[PDB]
Amino acid sequence: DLGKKLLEAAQIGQLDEVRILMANGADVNASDTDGLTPLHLAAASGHLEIVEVLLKTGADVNATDKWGDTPLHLAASQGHLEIVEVLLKAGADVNATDFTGNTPLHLAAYIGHLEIVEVLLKHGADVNAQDKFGKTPFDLAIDNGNEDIAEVLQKAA
Amino acid sequence: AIPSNTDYPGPHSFDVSFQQSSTAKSATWTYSTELKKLYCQIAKTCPIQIKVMTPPPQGAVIRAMPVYKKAEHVTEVVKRCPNHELSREFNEGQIAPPSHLIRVEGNSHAQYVEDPITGRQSVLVPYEPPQVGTEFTTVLYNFMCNSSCVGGMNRRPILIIVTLETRDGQVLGRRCFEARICACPGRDRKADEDSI
Ligand SMILES: [Zn+2]
């Protein structure tokens, strides 16, 4: 199953295998039973060149998995800065909202990726967006002791 | 006989904790204090902090053993799926047997145990006190299969049981946390916390 092989190659960082599978007709938008696509997996793992070649070969920058998360959510949650930048240029919504109300800025602020927080703000990240529990990105930065991020978010309020 | 998961501080006030974030260049792991749940990517370094209030005896060891969380699974031994066991990835010539889910990183005296009666697999390190002027003993763990792996854990949740033991295998202390080996630790932690 070329889809299954492509998902695995994208997750584990096998760039040559990704290129070979797509040349052999692997569905660039294949999904597993959690709705993760090769682009989700490369974005979460941090494989920049794979993310680029998937987007060049027709990967869906807006695809949502079973949590409603886009590849930008996953790169933002992990701290993969160059991937966040490439996804925004390629058409990602900076304020894509998952099924429990997280934006990429919620996840960056919570886990504590300062440089990602700065890049998301420059692309119109919404500081007022509330998750399912009423929490803003600032609320989550305070709750997880990310002081420098809370300061940056307060200045952007 | 099922391994006990009961928390037991014991006479040395044994406790297991996690630093506030990965010192990796990305969220290779993250720990939920709300859910007492570690989230990590496959084979990444996971530092776990051990604290005691009085020195353990000479010869004490720290064991880490994975067990299934749900009563319907707990009798099944937790090991790597065949695909990861037989992969060449991470399986270069080394002390850890390739079936073991839990490895220790950076300790030549880590010992891989398979009980010849129960078939349970675990990994030991000698207990060492903290380096002078630190609070914690750090043990580096690696978790060598995804929670989702169909030939192994197959989306069943696991607990990591951390036991402080005498040389002769008497329990001195025990702490337990849930572990998930997943694609995106940062998202999975928030999603799980959101769900509860
Ligand atoms: Zn596996």
Numbering used by the authors:
A (entry chain B): 3 to 159
B (entry chain A): 125 to 320
Task: Quote the original article.
Using ITC titration experiments we measured a dissociation constant KD of 108 nM for DARPin C14 and 32 nM for DARPin G4 while no interaction with a control DARPin could be detected. To identify the exact interaction interfaces of the DARPins to the p63 DBD we crystallized both DARPins in complex with the p63 DBD. The structures revealed that both DARPins bind to the DNA-binding interface and interact with the helix H3, the preceding loop and the C-terminal part of β-sheet S10 as well as residues in loop L3. All these sites are involved in and crucial for DNA binding. The loop L1 that in p53 provides an additional contact via K120 (conserved in p63), which however is not essential for DNA binding, interacts with the non-randomized scaffold of the DARPins, resulting in steric hindrance but no specific interaction. In the second DARPin-DBD complex within the asymmetric units present in both crystals, this L1 loop is disordered. All contacts between both proteins are summarized in Fig. 1D, E and Supplementary Fig. 1G-J. These data suggest that interaction with the DARPins competes with binding to DNA and that the DARPins act as a competitive inhibitor for DNA binding. Pre-incubation with either DARPin C14 or G4 resulted in complete inhibition of binding to the DNA oligomer while a control DARPin showed no significant effect. We further investigated the specificity of the selected DARPins by ITC experiments. These experiments showed that for the DBD a selective p63 binding DARPin was not identified since DARPin C14 bound to the p73 DBD with 16 nM affinity as well. Virtually no interaction was detected with the p53 DBD, however. Co-expression of DARPin C14 reactivated the transcriptional activity of p53.
